[PDB]
Amino acid sequence: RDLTLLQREERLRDLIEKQDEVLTPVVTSKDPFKDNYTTFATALDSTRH
Amino acid sequence: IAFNQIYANEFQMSPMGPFFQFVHQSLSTCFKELESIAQFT
Amino acid sequence: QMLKEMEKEVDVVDAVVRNATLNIPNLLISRIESEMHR
Amino acid sequence: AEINQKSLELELLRLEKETADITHPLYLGQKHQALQAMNSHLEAVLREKRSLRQRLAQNLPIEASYHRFTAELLPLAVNFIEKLEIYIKTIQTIPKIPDCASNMDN
């Protein structure tokens, strides 16, 4: 039982570590993008009517 | 990042592409609308 | 959550991003002649 | 012995359920798709930066995404001009449209 549970936890850790490495840069640049994009889209939308 | 950079520098090749599209779509809709009114009568 | 909140904006932006013998009608000729100076 | 085996199985299944949102291929696949759609969209926006700039500020060197609209605009304009009188008559009939609808109903 102990060996089997340890093997599964190790696999889970490996998977989480690989994801953290790639998600951290995207979350940090999110808020400036969303705000710049929304302002841009609203400005563009006012020229079509 | 590339967008934010262009948004800060340029938004915040000739720039003519969007004018053509708009005029084309608006004019087409106008055509069809008038034809429909005539047909109803 | 960010991707879902930006859907409407994407659409607007997408909308923007995406033998010629001419018989001129008398009505238009009359208009062009009356405003010819302008 | 039998109880011990089943108990282990239960423990394993519970661990898998609790971490599925971040680990299972199904859920991870959905997140990929959402991200690819946005990428493509941004690529397009960057490709048409000049035209978009000109609009905000308001062979022929025109961005390829707009060739169609540019080529078709001529015929469309010609057609409109030629049918101008018909469009004007039609517009004059617009106040009769409610009467026309009532007579037809009768």
UniProtKB/Swiss-Prot annotation, chain A:
Q: Where in the cell is it found?
A: Cytoplasm; Cytoplasm, Cytoskeleton, Microtubule organizing center, Centrosome; Cytoplasm, Cytoskeleton, Spindle; Cytoplasm, Cytoskeleton, Spindle pole
Top-level lineage group: Eukaryota
Instruction: Tell me how this protein assembles.
Output: Component of the HAUS augmin-like complex. The complex interacts with the gamma-tubulin ring complex and this interaction is required for spindle assembly. Associates with microtubules. The interaction with microtubules is strong during mitosis, while it is weak or absent during interphase. It is unclear whether this interaction is direct or indirect.
What this chain does, per the record? Contributes to mitotic spindle assembly, maintenance of centrosome integrity and completion of cytokinesis as part of the HAUS augmin-like complex.
Describe the family membership recorded for this protein in Swiss-Prot or TrEMBL. Belongs to the HAUS8 family.
Designated name of the protein: HAUS augmin-like complex subunit 8
The UniProt gene name for this protein comes to haus8
- Indicate the span of the full protein covered: 211 to 259 of 367
